[PDB]
Design a protein around this ligand. Structure first.
Ligand code: X86
Length: 294
Protein backbone atom coordinates (compact mmCIF):
# COMPACT_ATOMS: atom_id res chain seq x y z
CA UNK A 1 0.00 0.00 0.00
CA UNK A 2 1.02 3.63 0.50
CA UNK A 3 -1.83 5.75 1.88
CA UNK A 4 -3.37 2.84 3.77
CA UNK A 5 -2.01 1.12 6.84
CA UNK A 6 -3.13 -2.52 6.98
CA UNK A 7 -4.90 -3.34 10.24
CA UNK A 8 -5.96 -6.95 9.67
CA UNK A 9 -6.84 -9.38 6.91
CA UNK A 10 -10.59 -9.78 6.58
CA UNK A 11 -10.17 -12.69 4.18
CA UNK A 12 -10.15 -13.80 0.56
CA UNK A 13 -13.15 -12.35 -1.26
CA UNK A 14 -14.70 -13.44 -4.55
CA UNK A 15 -12.39 -11.08 -6.44
CA UNK A 16 -9.30 -10.84 -4.22
CA UNK A 17 -7.86 -10.19 -0.76
CA UNK A 18 -9.71 -7.84 1.58
CA UNK A 19 -8.04 -5.90 4.39
CA UNK A 20 -9.30 -3.69 7.16
CA UNK A 21 -7.11 -0.60 6.70
CA UNK A 22 -6.57 2.90 8.00
CA UNK A 23 -6.22 5.93 5.77
CA UNK A 24 -2.99 7.48 7.00
CA UNK A 25 -3.98 11.02 5.98
CA UNK A 26 -7.55 11.09 7.33
CA UNK A 27 -7.39 8.29 9.91
CA UNK A 28 -10.54 6.84 8.35
CA UNK A 29 -10.92 3.07 8.87
CA UNK A 30 -12.05 1.25 5.72
CA UNK A 31 -12.27 -2.07 3.87
CA UNK A 32 -9.68 -2.25 1.10
CA UNK A 33 -10.22 -4.81 -1.65
CA UNK A 34 -7.55 -5.66 -4.17
CA UNK A 35 -9.33 -6.75 -7.37
CA UNK A 36 -7.86 -9.65 -9.35
CA UNK A 37 -5.38 -10.19 -15.00
CA UNK A 38 -3.43 -7.81 -17.27
CA UNK A 39 -4.43 -4.21 -17.97
CA UNK A 40 -7.71 -3.72 -16.09
CA UNK A 41 -10.65 -3.66 -18.58
CA UNK A 42 -11.68 -0.04 -19.17
CA UNK A 43 -15.34 -1.08 -19.26
CA UNK A 44 -15.09 -2.40 -15.71
CA UNK A 45 -13.48 0.88 -14.63
CA UNK A 46 -16.27 3.00 -16.04
CA UNK A 47 -18.94 0.71 -14.61
CA UNK A 48 -17.48 0.41 -11.14
CA UNK A 49 -16.94 4.17 -11.12
CA UNK A 50 -20.65 4.72 -11.65
CA UNK A 51 -21.19 2.88 -8.35
CA UNK A 52 -19.56 5.73 -6.37
CA UNK A 53 -22.86 7.59 -6.70
CA UNK A 54 -25.12 4.68 -5.69
CA UNK A 55 -25.46 5.93 -2.10
CA UNK A 56 -27.99 4.68 0.44
CA UNK A 57 -27.96 4.00 4.19
CA UNK A 58 -28.38 0.27 3.58
CA UNK A 59 -25.71 0.03 0.88
CA UNK A 60 -22.04 -0.29 1.90
CA UNK A 61 -20.53 2.91 0.55
CA UNK A 62 -17.92 2.72 -2.21
CA UNK A 63 -15.44 5.38 -1.08
CA UNK A 64 -12.95 5.16 -3.92
CA UNK A 65 -11.90 3.22 -6.97
CA UNK A 66 -8.13 3.30 -7.25
CA UNK A 67 -6.66 2.45 -10.61
CA UNK A 68 -2.90 3.03 -10.27
CA UNK A 69 0.16 0.98 -11.25
CA UNK A 70 -2.34 -0.86 -13.43
CA UNK A 71 -3.82 -2.41 -10.30
CA UNK A 72 -7.43 -2.21 -9.08
CA UNK A 73 -8.40 -1.44 -5.49
CA UNK A 74 -11.86 -0.70 -4.17
CA UNK A 75 -12.18 1.23 -0.92
CA UNK A 76 -15.36 0.58 1.04
CA UNK A 77 -17.00 1.77 4.21
CA UNK A 78 -16.07 -0.62 7.06
CA UNK A 79 -18.56 -2.51 9.24
CA UNK A 80 -17.46 -4.84 12.06
CA UNK A 81 -19.37 -8.01 11.34
CA UNK A 82 -21.11 -9.90 8.54
CA UNK A 83 -24.46 -11.73 8.82
CA UNK A 84 -22.92 -15.18 8.23
CA UNK A 85 -20.78 -14.86 11.33
CA UNK A 86 -23.69 -13.34 13.26
CA UNK A 87 -25.92 -16.26 12.31
CA UNK A 88 -23.36 -18.85 13.39
CA UNK A 89 -23.01 -16.88 16.63
CA UNK A 90 -26.79 -16.92 17.12
CA UNK A 91 -27.32 -20.59 16.23
CA UNK A 92 -27.95 -21.36 19.91
CA UNK A 93 -31.20 -19.48 20.43
CA UNK A 94 -31.57 -17.99 16.95
CA UNK A 95 -31.89 -14.37 15.87
CA UNK A 96 -35.02 -12.91 17.53
CA UNK A 97 -37.89 -12.41 15.06
CA UNK A 98 -37.98 -8.63 15.63
CA UNK A 99 -34.35 -8.38 14.55
CA UNK A 100 -34.91 -10.73 11.61
CA UNK A 101 -37.81 -8.54 10.52
CA UNK A 102 -35.84 -5.33 10.97
CA UNK A 103 -32.96 -6.73 8.94
CA UNK A 104 -35.23 -8.02 6.17
CA UNK A 105 -36.97 -4.62 6.06
CA UNK A 106 -33.68 -2.72 5.77
CA UNK A 107 -32.32 -5.13 3.14
CA UNK A 108 -35.47 -4.65 1.03
CA UNK A 109 -35.03 -0.87 1.25
CA UNK A 110 -31.49 -1.28 -0.06
CA UNK A 111 -32.67 -3.50 -2.91
CA UNK A 112 -35.51 -1.11 -3.72
CA UNK A 113 -32.99 1.71 -3.98
CA UNK A 114 -30.48 -0.11 -6.20
CA UNK A 115 -33.18 -1.64 -8.37
CA UNK A 116 -34.80 1.75 -8.99
CA UNK A 117 -31.39 2.84 -10.38
CA UNK A 118 -31.27 -0.34 -12.47
CA UNK A 119 -28.39 -1.84 -10.50
CA UNK A 120 -28.48 -5.57 -9.59
CA UNK A 121 -26.37 -7.44 -7.11
CA UNK A 122 -26.63 -11.00 -8.55
CA UNK A 123 -24.65 -12.73 -5.77
CA UNK A 124 -26.28 -11.92 -2.47
CA UNK A 125 -25.31 -14.13 0.46
CA UNK A 126 -24.98 -13.77 4.25
CA UNK A 127 -21.26 -13.05 3.91
CA UNK A 128 -21.98 -9.82 2.06
CA UNK A 129 -24.69 -8.46 4.36
CA UNK A 130 -22.86 -6.33 6.96
CA UNK A 131 -24.03 -5.17 10.38
CA UNK A 132 -23.08 -2.69 13.07
CA UNK A 133 -23.86 -2.15 16.76
CA UNK A 134 -26.68 0.28 15.91
CA UNK A 135 -28.94 -2.38 14.43
CA UNK A 136 -28.22 -1.37 10.81
CA UNK A 137 -27.56 -3.96 8.10
CA UNK A 138 -26.09 -3.09 4.71
CA UNK A 139 -25.67 -4.84 1.37
CA UNK A 140 -22.08 -5.12 0.12
CA UNK A 141 -20.83 -5.48 -3.46
CA UNK A 142 -23.87 -4.36 -5.44
CA UNK A 143 -22.94 -4.00 -9.09
CA UNK A 144 -19.62 -5.85 -8.98
CA UNK A 145 -20.99 -9.00 -10.65
CA UNK A 146 -22.02 -6.99 -13.70
CA UNK A 147 -18.61 -5.31 -13.78
CA UNK A 148 -16.48 -8.40 -13.07
CA UNK A 149 -18.77 -11.42 -13.52
CA UNK A 150 -19.16 -14.26 -10.97
CA UNK A 151 -16.42 -16.97 -10.83
CA UNK A 152 -16.84 -20.67 -10.07
CA UNK A 153 -13.92 -20.50 -7.62
CA UNK A 154 -12.27 -17.56 -5.86
CA UNK A 155 -8.58 -16.81 -6.44
CA UNK A 156 -7.64 -19.11 -3.53
CA UNK A 157 -9.83 -21.82 -5.15
CA UNK A 158 -12.66 -21.62 -2.62
CA UNK A 159 -15.96 -22.69 -4.17
CA UNK A 160 -18.34 -19.74 -4.61
CA UNK A 161 -21.64 -20.73 -2.99
CA UNK A 162 -24.65 -21.59 -5.17
CA UNK A 163 -27.08 -21.70 -2.22
CA UNK A 164 -28.70 -18.37 -2.97
CA UNK A 165 -28.80 -18.63 -6.78
CA UNK A 166 -32.17 -18.01 -8.48
CA UNK A 167 -33.56 -20.86 -10.62
CA UNK A 168 -33.59 -18.84 -13.85
CA UNK A 169 -29.83 -18.44 -13.46
CA UNK A 170 -29.35 -22.17 -12.84
CA UNK A 171 -31.46 -22.92 -15.94
CA UNK A 172 -29.19 -20.84 -18.15
CA UNK A 173 -31.00 -17.55 -18.66
CA UNK A 174 -28.51 -15.00 -19.97
CA UNK A 175 -30.48 -11.92 -18.91
CA UNK A 176 -30.79 -11.35 -15.17
CA UNK A 177 -33.60 -9.24 -13.73
CA UNK A 178 -33.96 -7.63 -10.32
CA UNK A 179 -35.89 -10.75 -9.35
CA UNK A 180 -32.64 -12.66 -8.85
CA UNK A 181 -31.87 -10.56 -5.74
CA UNK A 182 -35.33 -11.03 -4.25
CA UNK A 183 -34.82 -14.80 -4.56
CA UNK A 184 -31.47 -14.67 -2.80
CA UNK A 185 -32.95 -12.51 -0.03
CA UNK A 186 -35.86 -14.90 0.37
CA UNK A 187 -33.35 -17.74 0.86
CA UNK A 188 -31.45 -15.67 3.45
CA UNK A 189 -34.71 -14.79 5.24
CA UNK A 190 -35.61 -18.49 5.48
CA UNK A 191 -32.12 -19.30 6.82
CA UNK A 192 -32.32 -16.63 9.56
CA UNK A 193 -35.62 -18.14 10.65
CA UNK A 194 -34.75 -21.83 10.64
CA UNK A 195 -31.02 -21.52 11.33
CA UNK A 196 -30.32 -23.87 8.47
CA UNK A 197 -29.60 -23.02 4.83
CA UNK A 198 -32.76 -23.43 2.75
CA UNK A 199 -31.12 -24.93 -0.40
CA UNK A 200 -27.52 -25.96 0.38
CA UNK A 201 -26.58 -27.38 -3.02
CA UNK A 202 -23.05 -28.52 -3.76
CA UNK A 203 -23.27 -28.46 -7.58
CA UNK A 204 -25.52 -26.68 -10.06
CA UNK A 205 -27.79 -29.67 -10.55
CA UNK A 206 -27.88 -30.48 -6.83
CA UNK A 207 -28.84 -26.85 -6.21
CA UNK A 208 -31.57 -26.97 -8.81
CA UNK A 209 -32.95 -30.31 -7.63
CA UNK A 210 -32.97 -29.16 -4.01
CA UNK A 211 -35.16 -26.24 -5.08
CA UNK A 212 -37.41 -28.59 -7.09
CA UNK A 213 -37.80 -31.00 -4.17
CA UNK A 214 -39.08 -28.25 -1.89
CA UNK A 215 -41.07 -26.00 -4.23
CA UNK A 216 -42.04 -28.66 -6.77
CA UNK A 217 -40.59 -29.18 -10.24
CA UNK A 218 -41.63 -26.13 -12.26
CA UNK A 219 -43.94 -26.57 -15.25
CA UNK A 220 -45.62 -24.29 -17.80
CA UNK A 221 -48.58 -23.56 -15.52
CA UNK A 222 -46.54 -21.94 -12.75
CA UNK A 223 -43.67 -20.74 -14.95
CA UNK A 224 -44.65 -19.93 -18.56
CA UNK A 225 -41.61 -20.51 -20.73
CA UNK A 226 -39.62 -22.68 -18.31
CA UNK A 227 -39.44 -25.71 -20.61
CA UNK A 228 -37.71 -23.51 -23.21
CA UNK A 229 -34.86 -22.39 -20.94
CA UNK A 230 -31.29 -23.12 -22.15
CA UNK A 231 -30.55 -25.78 -19.51
CA UNK A 232 -34.03 -27.21 -18.99
CA UNK A 233 -34.25 -30.96 -19.58
CA UNK A 234 -37.59 -32.79 -20.01
CA UNK A 235 -35.85 -35.60 -18.11
CA UNK A 236 -35.86 -33.58 -14.85
CA UNK A 237 -37.62 -35.58 -12.09
CA UNK A 238 -41.09 -34.24 -11.28
CA UNK A 239 -41.34 -33.55 -7.56
CA UNK A 240 -44.51 -32.32 -5.88
CA UNK A 241 -44.43 -29.06 -3.93
CA UNK A 242 -44.14 -29.18 -0.13
CA UNK A 243 -46.02 -26.95 2.33
CA UNK A 244 -44.35 -23.76 3.58
CA UNK A 245 -45.65 -24.69 7.00
CA UNK A 246 -43.07 -27.46 6.77
CA UNK A 247 -40.40 -25.38 5.01
CA UNK A 248 -39.89 -22.61 7.56
CA UNK A 249 -41.57 -23.56 10.83
CA UNK A 250 -42.53 -21.93 13.02
CA UNK A 251 -42.75 -18.68 11.00
CA UNK A 252 -46.26 -17.12 11.10
CA UNK A 253 -48.53 -16.80 8.07
CA UNK A 254 -47.46 -13.18 7.33
CA UNK A 255 -43.86 -14.35 7.14
CA UNK A 256 -44.75 -17.44 5.10
CA UNK A 257 -46.92 -15.37 2.71
CA UNK A 258 -44.05 -12.94 2.05
CA UNK A 259 -41.46 -15.70 1.63
CA UNK A 260 -43.74 -17.51 -0.81
CA UNK A 261 -43.90 -14.37 -2.95
CA UNK A 262 -40.11 -13.94 -2.84
CA UNK A 263 -39.65 -17.54 -4.01
CA UNK A 264 -42.16 -17.62 -6.90
CA UNK A 265 -40.48 -19.50 -9.81
CA UNK A 266 -41.50 -17.05 -12.54
CA UNK A 267 -39.18 -14.00 -12.10
CA UNK A 268 -42.01 -11.87 -13.43
CA UNK A 269 -44.39 -13.05 -10.71
CA UNK A 270 -41.79 -12.76 -7.94
CA UNK A 271 -42.52 -9.85 -5.60
CA UNK A 272 -40.50 -6.64 -6.10
CA UNK A 273 -38.54 -5.06 -3.24
CA UNK A 274 -40.87 -2.05 -3.18
CA UNK A 275 -44.00 -4.20 -3.02
CA UNK A 276 -42.40 -6.44 -0.38
CA UNK A 277 -41.88 -3.38 1.83
CA UNK A 278 -45.69 -2.90 1.82
CA UNK A 279 -46.44 -6.50 2.87
CA UNK A 280 -48.42 -6.97 6.11
CA UNK A 281 -45.43 -8.84 7.61
CA UNK A 282 -43.87 -5.43 8.26
CA UNK A 283 -46.85 -3.92 10.10
CA UNK A 284 -45.04 -4.14 13.45
CA UNK A 285 -41.45 -3.70 12.30
CA UNK A 286 -39.05 -2.05 14.76
CA UNK A 287 -35.29 -1.50 14.95
CA UNK A 288 -33.81 -3.64 17.77
CA UNK A 289 -30.10 -3.55 18.52
CA UNK A 290 -28.22 -6.82 18.16
CA UNK A 291 -26.04 -8.35 20.85
CA UNK A 292 -22.65 -7.89 19.22
CA UNK A 293 -19.40 -8.81 20.94
CA UNK A 294 -16.54 -7.42 18.85
C1 X86 B 1 -13.30 -11.95 2.74
O1 X86 B 1 -14.67 -12.21 2.91
C2 X86 B 1 -15.12 -12.83 4.07
C3 X86 B 1 -16.53 -12.33 4.38
C4 X86 B 1 -16.42 -10.98 5.10
N1 X86 B 1 -16.13 -9.92 4.09
C5 X86 B 1 -16.20 -8.64 4.35
C6 X86 B 1 -16.63 -8.18 5.63
C7 X86 B 1 -16.71 -6.77 5.94
N2 X86 B 1 -17.11 -6.36 7.12
C8 X86 B 1 -17.50 -7.27 8.26
C9 X86 B 1 -16.29 -7.93 8.92
C10 X86 B 1 -16.24 -9.33 9.07
C11 X86 B 1 -15.13 -9.94 9.68
C12 X86 B 1 -14.08 -9.11 10.12
N3 X86 B 1 -14.10 -7.75 9.98
C13 X86 B 1 -15.19 -7.17 9.39
C14 X86 B 1 -16.36 -5.82 4.93
C15 X86 B 1 -16.44 -4.45 5.15
N4 X86 B 1 -16.63 -3.60 4.10
O2 X86 B 1 -16.37 -3.98 6.28
C16 X86 B 1 -15.93 -6.29 3.65
C17 X86 B 1 -15.84 -7.69 3.35
N5 X86 B 1 -15.44 -8.07 2.19
O3 X86 B 1 -15.12 -7.18 1.27
O4 X86 B 1 -15.30 -9.33 1.88
Amino acid sequence: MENFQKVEKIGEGTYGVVYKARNKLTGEVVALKKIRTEGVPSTAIREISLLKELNHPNIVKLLDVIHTENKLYLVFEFLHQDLKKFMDASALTGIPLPLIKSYLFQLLQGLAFCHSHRVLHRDLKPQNLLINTEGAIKLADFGLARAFGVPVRTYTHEVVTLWYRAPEILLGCKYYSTAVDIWSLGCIFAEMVTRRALFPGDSEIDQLFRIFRTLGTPDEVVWPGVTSMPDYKPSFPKWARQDFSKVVPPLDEDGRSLLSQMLHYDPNKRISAKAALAHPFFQDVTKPVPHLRL
